[PDB]
Symmetry: C3
Subunit: 149 residues, 3 copies
């Protein structure tokens, strides 16, 4: 079943919103299949955010993301990539839709609560980057026969 990578960023951690964001993920039907609290080493940040190297926000991004722990996650569900993006909300939390994670919890574009893979793929690439698969559990859940036909 489709997987995506999600990351609760240091702003949500330092604002004590870990449970709230995880709740929004869970109640949507998405299955948490890997998850760990970790400090992000420099080299991981830079490879994760490689595609942003030329951009004005890059240095700030790398600093922010290495500034306190993140909660890294693998999340599984039909259409998981696009589902996650929909509940996370657009990149600028001031335009992110009310009811989305960024739309309800975030203020500014550079401190926007959570990251999700933007496609199949960068998902996966990001999953392989952050997780070895002995870290990724596989389990059936009671609700599954009720989420899906």
């Amino acid at each position: 079943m489709e997987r995506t990578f999600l990351m609760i960023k240091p702003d949500a951690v330092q604002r004590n919103l870990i449970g709230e964001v995880i709740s929004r993920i869970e109640r949507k039907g998405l299955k948490l299949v890997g998850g760990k609290l970790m400090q992000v080493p420099m080299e991981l940040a830079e490879t994760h955010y490689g595609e942003h190297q030329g951009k004005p926000f890059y240095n700030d991004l790398i600093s922010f993301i290495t500034s306190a722990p993140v909660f890294a996650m693998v999340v599984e569900g039909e259409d998981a990539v696009n589902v996650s993006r929909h509940i996370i909300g657009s990149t600028n939390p001031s335009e992110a839709s009310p009811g989305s994670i960024r739309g309800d919890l975030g203020l500014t574009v550079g401190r926007n609560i959570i990251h999700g893979s933007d496609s199949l793929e960068s998902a996966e690439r990001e999953i392989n980057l952050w997780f070895n698969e002995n870290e990724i559990t596989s389990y059936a859940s009671p609700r599954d026969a009720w989420l899906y036909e």
Copy 2:
């Protein structure tokens, strides 16, 4: 005052989301005016979903909806039909707006939490189908003078 028919489907029942969905209905201002937990007999499913007889999802629909109890409801408020649809969200929960019932709780189009009448109507027709009106209470509520001019 306008009424509509709403139904909490077996997916929300089996996922233990009855109270959550009812809460979203109540806090919007809509008045619960009839409500019962019931197993849906075959013949009721088929007449309820009559308009879908030719369609690829039909057999799955009928099976799903008869597979565990539903919470059937009559709900009253100005513009109740269109209000309910707005908070329920579009049919595919992956596109349903965040903050909507389907947008927050549902994953797939065939397991989308709740049904609402799509017009004045089919409301109603559906109300008469599911409820005799000795089943439908009529009562004024303290908030009413505050919801409405």
Copy 3:
């Protein structure tokens, strides 16, 4: 930092939704910087809503808003004016986006829970109208270094 004026109207007060609406404001990142429960004197209503004098809903507006206490607020954050409007939702709560204050809590256009300044601005003008600034506190909060770059 940008400020806006917000007001919890007598419908939310009389529906006991004060905490809920304040929660939605707080968790977005907005800083409550002035706030008071007050009955709105006639002359204040009329100057507040001056721009609506010719309109069909005017007399109803003035009556409603003077009919029970309101919770008047000054709220501070980057882009506070437009942020507040986004989480409050469009004027008619039947079209206001699910997940917004009006979209989740309001039914009708004339009883729509809360008011927010519509621009820099009328903010602000409304702040000066409702608050003397000995009423407006200024304080740094622990989350601030996490909301903002």
